[PDB]
Structures are given as structure tokens and as C-alpha cells.
């Protein structure tokens, strides 16, 4: 069959074409022990990948091969790929077509080396590398709209009008869920709870995923929370309980004002969409405003679509009624679109055969894959 | 075969690998006469080791070569080793592998000189020196847990998570059964029975081993015993009978509050475990609380595990349910774990060959033995 | 005396009439701090203009008052003017005549408000606003020719035949050095070097000004550079070194094919000149082809005049031999022409006196200034 | 006048504004007796603060109110403050302005309660709480640079460029002189000298302050010291002499590799500075490399600045020449900077008046004090 | 007033508070006739106490109620107390406060029954029982030091540092002047003079008090005395003269080596002090070495302080200079300290009132008296 592997910065989503949801979602981490093994043969493993690293994180040093959508450690990335194939999918990579995803405006060498590893190390017969926002637009079952995809390493905006790309209106900000997690971990020190190790960063990520929400009116929420002192209790793995105060709505606020983490000139979620739309031709802006698609796990915060729609409406002219489409399953929207695309009968001629790679070498994906 | 010799401060336990219990347990004492021999040839021995010294203790001055887990008299220690081999095991040390144990954070010169004596004086072919808490965890048949080992000279706490050492969470207090015996001998003077000689210290040790018990509630027990005047009779070797009052539960109480013997800042049995657990990573604390292993003869007091479990539960957060594992045979738990480890087929490459010692000299055990 | 101030989009050039070169050239930027001042009195300034903003750009947010030749921020523009007078020229504006320049076919309100600010805020006695291409033709010392001026915000083409204007043959494209800088900053992401802040945009501008060159044959250069992988090293301010590959000749290529930045229907440098010439009367085309004048800093790329002359010759009929005049000092050609014009004895009756402004109000410059 | 009180984790430094050095430096310890007073009226004191506790440490249990820059015992802290005012400065706190210091990214409640105690318990008229690194940069008489301050409880790095804060580039590691003292006390057990009581911890601290030095090449020093067995003699208070071997250069080595004390993922002295610089804007990094300021007593080890400068140069690009500024009086650099700041005529409007506290309550220092 | 009664094993010292010396010192003996009274009314007394028993010792059987500081005969002890009050002090015990002394670590029932007898049999209004070494330290007018008190039944060592007790460093050996007298009486049999009756034991005690001296070098003295045969003549009451040879310096030698009387493991005078000092904290040892206080009549031998100081200096480290304080009136040092303590105005609230005894019964002195 065909393999749809959505290698994200934080989570790896793998499966087969035609399915409605990925069958294997595990973190994109590689852990190694930081202490000598006192016993004999109990923990003989030297490298842990995926859920195994997450399970033993208390005695491991976790590492992310992908940073901001760019693979910074290729040995760990190929370890993750070997895991994803053999231990996760339990299929021979040589017998299946592999579909990969990548953020727009990534370095060319990243895609080139990814293709080289897929064709040589795993002997994949045919390969194709797509764009995450295009697949996210595919999954919604529409051919026109602007996709705001925010995952774990990068958020990008890609407008598409009736199937035609608008390459000069594509935005990209290296600010996503990992930056939010780091900011939350920093601002939790005010309450008196400091997390420093990589293992303790996962606890902060869980706090972010469970308690954080987007405030409808940040300034009003900030003042009312100051006096009422409303806070929620989060139970740490050791059994201790810590209280999370205004950090619940301050952590996702950095999406709407990235100056809180040093990105002073970064636009923010509504401003980036507005600028991307205004970079397009005047005749297509009205249909782009009326169809805004959210994707990625960093768009899953409570009240985020409503806040985004309210903020965009202020920027847009009074005759425009923006509509934000936030599917409940938008976390896996990229994988669903990739599965849909790979199941199309027209797409079967778009695969990059290994024979073509043997002829023209790398950078073949830079000409036919878009 | 292989020899598993657990040289403790008070008791020497020797045997062969594969056995379920040591075949020779005798005190680690060396006695010498303090009076001239009036008769001719009846008692021509000048040095007594082991049970012989204990049998003739009335006319001998007993000495312990090991103090607080550290050999303070090497001539007496090598006398004890010569006894343990020839008179006890009746085997040639040159034909067997010797496994030795040592408390954590001991001086390096102690282990170096022990290795030198084993390799040169006894010509042992291969040697290995382990850690008592690790072997105690081996004997329980588990790879995760925190071991509280309290013998005769020192009590130490060693956390181990899934076979990985946690060296920065290891505690060590030089307070064990010998200090309890001395405290009992001091507080028996209140009743009107003073023991001063080393021979009379063994009587106090027997009193401690037979009558002393840990009170579930020390303050309630102290008041009720004051009015009821409940006491038990202990028969001295000479035939006299002395009464032991509140000293039955006061003597082991110093384990839970070492300030009674001048160790004002020492933690105590539950506090030391709590601190050792809290020195570990937050992700491993929950599994360490749920598996606490007791070892050594000083943990054999009545109601000691129940009192320890109750005390630790107060310190631990309300979401934690500590479980204390106290095997009935925990006195020999270190030797059992050493026998199990030496019988493993993987361990056979971990012996320190005598050829290696001839090459790199001493301190070879500091690099490969842990 | 008289003041010749050439307020460009990127650079401000000021001086006095009769001089052969501007005495003060500084960027047209206004910077404001983005962080709170921790110390006391060291950096008490709140707004930085000119070279001061460029010097402290690492802690400032730089802004350009002029976009595409149109003043989009009048407060910052009047700050720049106040700087240019007092801190740069150190003369009283009330005592001198001011000569200003403006791109053709600009909005009328822009010139009206510029005149209002000059007459009211600075109390300038007499004012005149010219056209940059006319002054560029003045500086060459000729009365016939077609001027292709490309600065930082806009490129315009103005044909003049024997001193007579040809208003219906004037072209204007909002594509100049700033668009080239943005395109270079976008295409440097392929190598793996992303610049996002306004301060880092100046580094990209310096890269463009130092390394970029116009390829004689773009298609041949593109293929040969692909295989030879020829690239140059540029040292960033922090000390790091980044390699610039094919972006050296791709960045200025957008002048000859503006479709690379979304201006699909824009003509380009040779096509715009050809269309502007063909919009003129048939009797004047031959003399316009034989005298093409380049102006502005965006025409300073290596091999740009040769490439332009080759490209125009293909469009022109075979009986025409176009000649492109590219003076070495064409960056300041507008200012030189303004200085020459203001020093003419005939021009002294063309100033707009402040009394005339008090009578007819604004839009007086729309009738007598051309 | 004004009071400059630098409440550190280990040492309290107090004085008046305008002086070049603190007039009263005493340890921040509170001691209580652990034994009953046998005599009558000789030692009627029940709590000892400062040098008195240090003098009688042999019969006292010493406690540090401040841990890692955070006050963990407010009663002892206010005892220390009462001592510092009345017994040390011998002035009425109600008649003077008090300047306090605090580590960056401390819990907000710590500063709030400190302000509450100063305003209510001592009735201080006006108060101000600064940042230790900012004052350390003040004392050097420069407005640009990066300050590496390492005291007794925490080490922090604060970059400042031309007086503007860089809040997102501030690092903080809870590893300072007290952790070094604990590590030295642990590793002295290898030689055969165990210190356990709090009184004996001061002896280890004196050993660290007198004998420990930073090795220029740790690996080369470790091997050469192993064979030469070079060691120095330290005389204990009782008159005994103990030998300190490789622990002289191993104890301060944990600053450059904090994994020796369980901080496996902590950066270390050069790595923390490098990361803090690289968190800043590219335009300011070159000036931050060329001006590195050391502060605190934990930076006073021999050859520490040279080792740090060598280590940073390897991390920095080859075009960068880092310069480390280590004033001889850098132990009191924070107090000197505080005295300089409080003597400035501009600073006199920055005090938090008690009337303001009565109006807005606490957290007033969170808005105007930085 | 107040009564200071120092009930020793051999001598009873009584007096009133404020005096510089006891006004009544008599032996603590009770004698009874061993023969029938032949005459009529000449010697009608049946029990003799004090000097009367000593005067008629030739026809009486003398008995000591106190053995090793413990009252073994309460009827004789209360006879001695009745004598000491009525026949010696000639005051009503009901009208005075009584201060009593007791050796440390005595049985609790001894003190309880002493208090019961004082409160019930003699109807003493208020009572207090102190420690002999504490009072001996009081008499020297110092609050720090280590007291070596050796009387007639027991020698004990009590360190005190700045008024704070060090209970875990207190030593006690049941070997004092009576054991020396018995040893002298045994070793006088070698010369040919056997004393067996209790009356003849007093002659041996007088010989010990008049002729015995401590040898500076025992081994050198033993050899030189063997050849020179130097001996002194002692006149018995009957008029006979016996010669005392090497027994002059052998009798007090048992203090420095108690193995001569079967106390093989007893430390001896310098060893006991050294061990008691080393049981203390390291910070207080230096001041304890420099202040050693001698007390009791068994320390009155010639050259004893010099020999003790020489012996201790060998044990102490080379950096220590021990100083032994031996007041000329150290025999009554305990009584002087008791008189000083009872005259303090602060001590007046420390008396145990008879009403308190009626409420809480006995063992009240175990809580408030120390
Ligand atoms: N329910 C949630 N609410 C808020 N944030 C979430 C939620 N689930 C995941 N996230 C954030 O989204 C990130 C994962 O996004 P994902 O789409 O998996 O990224 P990628 O596409 O790189 O795999 C995590 O870092 C997490 O912080
Ligand atoms: N049944 C018992 N109850 C209480 N204490 C005991 C008991 N048996 C032994 N002990 C104490 O434990 C000590 C022996 O412990 P052990 O484990 O033999 O030490 P080591 O490991 O050094 O040989 C003795 O000093 C004794 O006081
Ligand atoms: N030597 C050069 N080579 C290439 N481009 C240059 C050079 N010098 C300046 N430029 C470009 O020209 C622009 C400045 O042109 P200028 O004539 O100063 O514009 P204006 O007329 O608006 O002041 C800059 O944005 C820069 O990108
Ligand atoms: N000369 C020295 N050499 C090495 N370390 C020192 C020296 N003096 C002090 N220290 C260490 O520095 C610490 C005191 O630093 P200090 O700046 O007083 O901290 P704080 O700012 O918290 O008062 C002590 O714990 C000590 O270990
Ligand atoms: N001048 C002396 N020289 C040597 N020993 C003496 C001297 N005087 C008394 N003694 C010894 O000291 C003992 C008396 O000591 P004392 O302090 O009275 O004891 P207590 O404190 O029990 O009353 C006697 O047994 C005697 O042997
Ligand atoms: Mg994704
Ligand atoms: Mg043991
Ligand atoms: Mg211009
Ligand atoms: Mg400090
Ligand atoms: Mg006495």
C-alpha cells in the first residue's frame, strides 16, 4: 500500500492511505540514559525512541531531532524513522510508497537529505514530499481558502484560491507550541515552581495542554484574575499539587502578541492572516476572508477560534465578515489530507520513482514536488 | 566455584554461589587473653577469632576490626579472612573467585587495601567488590526500588530506578546496631546494672536482640510504661536476673531520632528515606515510594516496618501510598543478592583478574567495579 | 543660501546649492527602543533618527516614513526633517530656500502636506518641489534623453526631448531596492539563514549592496552555478560567516523580470524603457534610444548597464543602436541636478514665496511647480 | 542617610550610600542551642545571629534563612534584619532609606513579603529593591555588558546593552557556592574525613575558600595529580591535620560541568554565558562578548577568569575575542553598585514611599521597581 | 539559711551557703561493737557515726553506707544524715534549704529515695540535687572546661562548653580512692605486713594519704627503686614501725593504668579525659584541652597534675597545649561550688518545694533538677 508519515516537530503521525485517522501517534523524541546501569541486563537499551523514552523520562535526557520544522540531528531522525517503520508500522519500507510533509520555505538541503535517506537507507520505491498547509486544505474538502497551521515548531500561513498557489503571500513564523511551553515554564517560576530538566519540560507541556485557555479579553481577564486570585490545582507525578494562576491565559496569549518572548516584530495570529490575505490580489481577498482553516495542535486552545475571528474582524474592512473554520480533528488535519491525496487516482503519476533519483540525483524533488 | 563473603561490621557471612543462605555466619571479633596462663598447654592459643573468641569471652579482650564499615585494624581483618577461608570454608582461596561487599561512599584506600590483600596475601585468581544495597535489591528479585540497609556499623540508602543508579541521592549515616547497643548499655545504668567490659557488651547486645522492640507511638508508650511499670526479666550468664523496663522501646527509638546519641542533625530512618527520594528526579519518586526494601539486622526490631511505613506516609504527599518491603530473611539479603549476582552468566566477564591487578596495580576496582 | 534636500525612500541627501556632491547622506529611518531602560540616564533618548538609529539598531525597531515614494508617517517625516536641518545642516530653515524632490504621479495630497509642513512648521521663506528624473537629466548636462531612475521605493521613466516634457510617456513601477532586499531576505532562507527583524533587514541590504551582481546571461549563469556551487562568504556582525550562493545574481534579476515578486504584469527595466519610448512621437524615438540615462542606487549593480543595453537592443528595431549612459556618480545624480538647477539665475523667479502660500493656500505648487 | 543592604544567601553586606565598601559583612546564619544550659546565666541567649552564631557554632545548630536566593524562613530572616539594623548599623530604620537586592526571576511573593516586612515591621520610610546583576554592572562604571554573578545560592546571567534590558536573554541556575561546599564535603569522604554537622560544614567552606582552585586543563591536571599525589595540609580547629588531594581542583570544576552534582542538563559557566549572548539580537552580540563582568564570591577561585575566557573563546566564532572583566573587589561589586545608584540625584524619585504602599498595598514594587 | 551537704563516698562535708569552706568534715562511716560490754554504762552506745566510730575503731566494725557513689545501706545513710544535722550542724532541718550532690549517671532510684528521705524523714522545706562536676566547675569561677573529679568511690569526667552541657561526652569509672586503698593493702603483704580488719584499712588509707606519690616516669622509677631500695618508715598506732618501699608510687599508678586491679579495659586518667574531649564537637575541643579542672581528694597525690598534663599532651595533637588546673583546695571544690550556686539570686527559683513533691510524688527531681 502507501504510507502517510507526518513527521512533525513534536509528534510523529504514521498510517496507511485510505484511513480516516493515523494509527500511530508518538512523540518525536530520542532519549539516552544519564546514569550508569547498576544492575545487570534490566535496562540494557542505550537509546530510547518514542513512548519508551517518554515512559523512562525520569532517567533519560530527551532530545528533539526537529527544531522549528528543520531536522537538526539526522542520526536521531533516522532512528525515529526506523522506529516508525519497524516497531510502529511493522512493515517493510521497500514495499510501500512513503508520503512526507514539510513546512513551506524550509531549507532545500533539509528536503534533499530527507529524500536521500528515504531512497538509500530505507530503499523506498517511490517518494513524495508535500506541504502541510496544502494537505490541511485537502482534508477540509475545499479548494479555496487560507490555512493557518500552528504545530510544535513553526506556524505558517498559505493562501490558496481555487487550487492555484499564491506563493508570494506565504508567511512563516518560528513560534509554536514549544515556544509556548518554554514561556509557560519560565513564568511558572513566579509562583515558586521551577522546572529545568527536559523531563520536567513534558510536565509543563501537559499543564499547557490541560489547563491553558485563550482569554476572550486579555486585559479584562488579567485585572479580574488579579483580584479574585482564581487558580487551579495541577497534580505533579510525584503526588505534589501546584497551583496555576494567571499563567493559564497568559501562556497562549503569546500567539496573539509574540513580543512576550522576544519576537517583538512578529505579527501574531490575526495580523499574520491579515497580512497574508492583503498580499494577494484584490479579487481573491473576499473569498479568503470567508474561509479560514485552522490546523495543528497549537490551535487547540479553548476559545482560540472565537478570539481569532474577533481579532481578524477588526482588521478587515467593515464590509467583510471573516469566518474561521476549526474542525474538531484539526490536530490530524495534515495527515488526513495526505491520506486523501495519496488515495487519488490522479496522484499516482506524481510519485518520485527511485530510478529518477538514481538518474538526476537529489534536488529532483525541488522540480516536480511542490 | 565462587565464594560470596559479606564482611560486615559485626557478623561475617560466607558461602558459595548458588546457595540460598550463607553456610557460615560468625561474629567479626578477634580476642586476646588479658591474663597469664597459669596451667601448661591447656590454652596455648594467643589469638581467638570468631566463635572461639565469643566462647572464651570471659578471659579475653574482644576487638572489632571493622568500625562503621571501615577496617581500622588490617592485621585482625586478615586474621578474620584467614579464619573464614581455612577454618570455616576449608577451601583453598587460590582456586575460587571471591565476591566482597562494601558500604557506599567508603574511603577509596579501604577498597584498595582490601583488593591488595585478597590478590597478594591469599592469591585469589579473580575478585569483585560490590555494594551492599545493590545486592539487597538483587535478592528481592526487582530492578526498581530504594533500599534502606542498616547493619552493625552504618546505615545507607541507595535508590535505583529500573537498573540505573542515582548516585547523587545516596545517603549514609554512621549509626547502626553497635551504637544502639552502646546506648542501651548506657541507659541500663539507670536501673542499676552497669556493664563496662567488652565481654559484657555482648550480653547487652543479646538483650537488645531478644527484648527490644519499636514502639508504635513512642510518646504514648513512654507515659503508659511509666505508670504501669511493665518490665521483663533477663537472665545473665552467671544466673542473676535483671529487669529491663522502658529501655526495651527506648533503645531502638534512636533509629527514628538519632539526637539521643549526639547525632542531633542526623535525619533518622523515615527522614533519610524521604530526603533520598526527594533528591531524585520527580518522574521516578512515585515508583520509589511504592517499593521500599529493608535490609540488615538492625531493621529486625519488632514493629519497625510498620512504624517506618507510618512515619514515611506523613512526610510523603497525601496522594502517595508508601509500601515497605521487609522480607523475613532480610538479615542475609545482601549475601543472597551477592550469590544471585555471582551465578549470573553475564557477570562472568565482570571479575577483576589477577593479571589486570599486576598490570594497573591497585585502584583498578575503582574503574570497573561499582 | 539655498538648501537642496533629496528626501528619498531609503536615503536622505542634503546640502547647499553650488556644491558638486551632498554633504550629508544618512538613512531615512526612525528607531524607537523595544525594551525598558534598566540603567539610569545612559540612553535617555526615546526616538533615534538617522545614523543614531542605525548604530543602535540592535535594541531599536526601525521604521521608514516613506514607502514607495509616499510619506506614510508624517510625524516621523517631520522628525527626519528637523534632524536634517538642525543636527545635520546646523542652519536655520527660515533663512534658506529649500528645494525638494518627488517621484512623478505621486498623490497630490503628499506634495500639498509636504509644502504645508515646510511653510508652517519650519517657516521656510520660499520653496520649490521638482521631479527626480528631470534633475537627473539636468545633472548629465543634456536637454534630451530618457531617464530611468530606480531608487529605494519606486522606479520611474521620464522621456524629455529638447526640454519639452512628454507627460503621456511617463511610466512608474513600485518596485525598487527595498523590494529587492525583501526578496533576497526571503530567498536566503533556502540556504538556512532566516532574517526577520528590521535590524536584520539592514544586514540583508548590506549583503545586496556588496555581493549581488547582474548576470549577463541569467539562464546560463543559473545552470553553471548549480554544478560548480560557487559561493562567497559574508561575515555577519556577530562574527559568524554565511555563504551566499546563486542569490548573488538572482536578487537583481527581479529588476529584469518582476514576476519573481508577484508583479507578473510589470514590464521590467528594458521593457519599461521600450514602452515609454514607443509612447512618444515617432520623430523623437531615435534620439531617445541613443541617450538613456540611469539614476538611483538600484541601478548600481555590476553589469547592470551592459545587460540593460543588450536587452533593449533586442526590442528596438535593427536600425537602432541604443546607448545607455551610466555615470559613476549616478546615485547622487538627482541631488547634483537639483543643485545645478537652483544655482541658475533664471530659476530664481520660480520659487514659491510664503506670501503666495498665505494667499492661495495649498495646491499652489500644483499650478506653478512641475 | 540611605542604607544599602545586600541580603545574600550566605553573607549579609550592609552600609551607607556613598561609601566605597560595606562596613559590616557577616554570615546570614541563625543558630540555636542543641543542649540544655547546665550553668546559670552564662549563656542565657536562646537565638544567635551573625558572627555570634559562627563563634559558638560548636554548641549550636546553624540555619540559613535564604536558600537559592529565596527566603525559606521569614522569622529567621526578620531576626537577621533586626540584627543588621540595631546591633550592626546601630541606626533607626525609620530614619533611613533602605535599598535591597534580589536575584532575577525570583518568586513574586518573596519580594512582596520582603517589602511588607520592611514597611510594616521596621517602618522604613521609602524602599527600593533592585537586581544584583544590574548593580554589579553599575559598579564597573559601564552601561553595556553581560554580568555573570555567582554568589552562595544562585548564579544568574543578565545582558545589558547601552542601558536597555534584554529580559528574554536572562539565565538562572540554582547552583552556587553552597552546592560546591556540599560537593566538597561529600568528596572529602574518599580521603577518610567525614563532616556531617552544620558546624563542620563551615570548616569545609573554609577549606573551599582557602585551598580550592580552578584547573586550567582539568583532564591533564587529574592525571598528573593521580601519579604525583600532590596534596596540601589543612589544620582543623581541634589541632588535627587532614590532607586535601585532587579535591582542590575537583570542587570548583562543578561550575564548568554541573553534571557532577546531578545537574546533568545545566549549561555551566561558559555555556550559560554563550547561550545568554546568543539569545540576544545579532547586532549586540559583538559588544557583549568583548565585555564580560564577573561578580559574587563564587567567581573568586584561582585561575577561574582565565579558564572561563579560554572556554568561551572556543564556543564563540573565530572572529570574536571575548574579554572577561574580573575586578579584584568583585565579591562586593553588587553592594558598590547599589551604593553608587542610591547616591545618584536622578534615583531620588525612584523610591517607593510608604504612602504608596498604604494606597496600593503590596505588589507596588512589581510595577515601578525593576 | 541554706545547707550545702556534699555526701561523698568517704567523707561528708557540710556547711552553710556563703561560706568559703565546709565547717564540718567527717568520715561517712557507721561503726558497731563486735564484743559484749563487760562494764556497766561506760560504752552504752550501740551505733557510732562519724569521728566517734573512727576514734573507737579498735573495738568496732566500720561500714560505709555509700559504695561507688551509690547508697547501699539506707538505714546507715539516714543515721549519717541525722548525725550531720543534729550533732554536727545543730540546726533544725525543717528551717533550712538542703543542697545535695550526686555523681552523674547514678541509678534513678538512688536520687528518688534520697529525695523521699529528705522530704519525709527530715521534713526539709525545699531541696535540690546537683552534679558534683558542675559544682566543681562553678568553684573555679569559669563557665567552660572539662572537670576530672576523683573522690573515694567513683571518678567521672564532665565537659561543659560556655555553660552548655555535653551529656554524650560524660565518662564514669568506678575506681577511686577506696580501690587505691585496697590495692595498697594487698601489695603491702609483699613486705610482710597484712592488714585485714576494717579498722586496719584506715591505717592503710592514712599511709596512702601521707606517703604515696605519683611517679613522673613509672618505669624509670620502678628500676631505680629496685636497686637503691629506698623506703620510708611509717609508725603504726601500736608503736611499731613498718617500711614502705616501691608501694609509694605503685599505689597511685593504678589511676593511670587501672589494669592493675582487674579493670583491664578501663581508660585511665589521661585516656578518659582524651576520650571525653574527642566525644565532643570538633569546634569545642581546643578550648576544652586548654582548661582541665581537677577535683576530689584522689587527685591530691604529689606530681599527679604534672604527670597527667604530660600524658594528655602525648595523646593530643601536636598543635594542642593542654593545661591542667589543680587548685590547692580542690578537695572541697564541689562544696565551694555548691555554696556559690546556692547563694546566687537566680538559683532561688530552682528549689524543689515540698508542695511539689506532695503533688507529683518522687521523680520530680528527674525533670527539673539536672
Ligand atoms: N489539547 C491541546 N490544547 C492546547 N495545546 C495542545 C493540545 N494538544 C497539543 N497541543 C500543543 O500542540 C503541540 C503538538 O502539535 P502537533 O500538531 O502534534 O505538532 P506537529 O504537527 O509538529 O506534530 C504540542 O507541543 C502541544 O504543546
Ligand atoms: N533479631 C534481631 N533484632 C534486633 N536487632 C538485631 C537482631 N539480630 C541482629 N540484630 C542487630 O543487628 C546487628 C547485626 O547486623 P548484621 O546485618 O549482621 O550486620 P553486618 O551486615 O555488619 O554483618 C547486631 O549488632 C545486632 O545488634
Ligand atoms: N553599490 C550598490 N549596489 C547595489 N545596490 C545599491 C548600492 N548602493 C545602494 N543600493 C541600493 O539602492 C538603495 C538606495 O538608493 P537611493 O538612490 O539612495 O534611493 P533614494 O533615492 O530613495 O534615496 C538601497 O536600498 C540599496 O538597496
Ligand atoms: N576567596 C574565595 N575563593 C573561593 N570561594 C569563595 C571565596 N570567598 C567566598 N567564596 C564562596 O562564595 C560564597 C560567598 O559569596 P557571596 O558573594 O558572599 O554570596 P552572597 O552574594 O549570597 O552573599 C561562599 O559560600 C564561599 O563558598
Ligand atoms: N592528701 C591526700 N593525698 C592523696 N590522697 C588523698 C589525700 N586526701 C584524701 N585522699 C584520698 O581521697 C579520698 C577522699 O576523697 P573525697 O574528695 O573526700 O571523696 P568524697 O568526695 O567521696 O568525699 C580518700 O579515700 C583518700 O584515699
Ligand atoms: Mg505538523
Ligand atoms: Mg552488612
Ligand atoms: Mg531618489
Ligand atoms: Mg549576592
Ligand atoms: Mg565527692
Numbering used by the authors:
A (entry chain D), B (entry chain C), C (entry chain E), D (entry chain A), E (entry chain B): 6 to 375
What does the paper say about this structure?
To uncover the molecular basis of rapid LmActin filament depolymerization, we determined the structures of ADP- and ADP-Pi-states of LmActin by cryogenic electron microscopy (cryo-EM) in the absence of any actin-stabilizing agents at average resolutions of 2.7 and 3.3 Å, respectively. Moreover, the subunit conformation in the ADP-Pi state is nearly identical to the reported ADP-Pi state of muscle actin (RMSD 0.454 Å). From these experiments, we estimated that the rate of Pi-release from actin filaments is ~5–10-fold more rapid in LmActin compared to RbActin under the same experimental conditions. Thus, similar to RbActin, the release of phosphate triggers the faster departure of actin monomers from the filament barbed ends, but the lifetime of the ADP-Pi state in LmActin filaments is greatly reduced compared to mammalian actin. However, the residues around the proposed “backdoor” pathway for phosphate dissociation are conserved between the two actins. Thus, it is possible that both the dynamics of the nucleotide-binding pocket and subunit dynamics within the actin filament may contribute to the faster Pi-release from LmActin compared to vertebrate actins.
We show that, despite > 1 billion years of evolution, pathogenic Leishmania major parasite and mammalian actins share the same overall fold and co-polymerize with each other. Overall, these structures of Leishmania actin demonstrate that the helical nature of actin is remarkably conserved from divergent unicellular parasites to mammals.
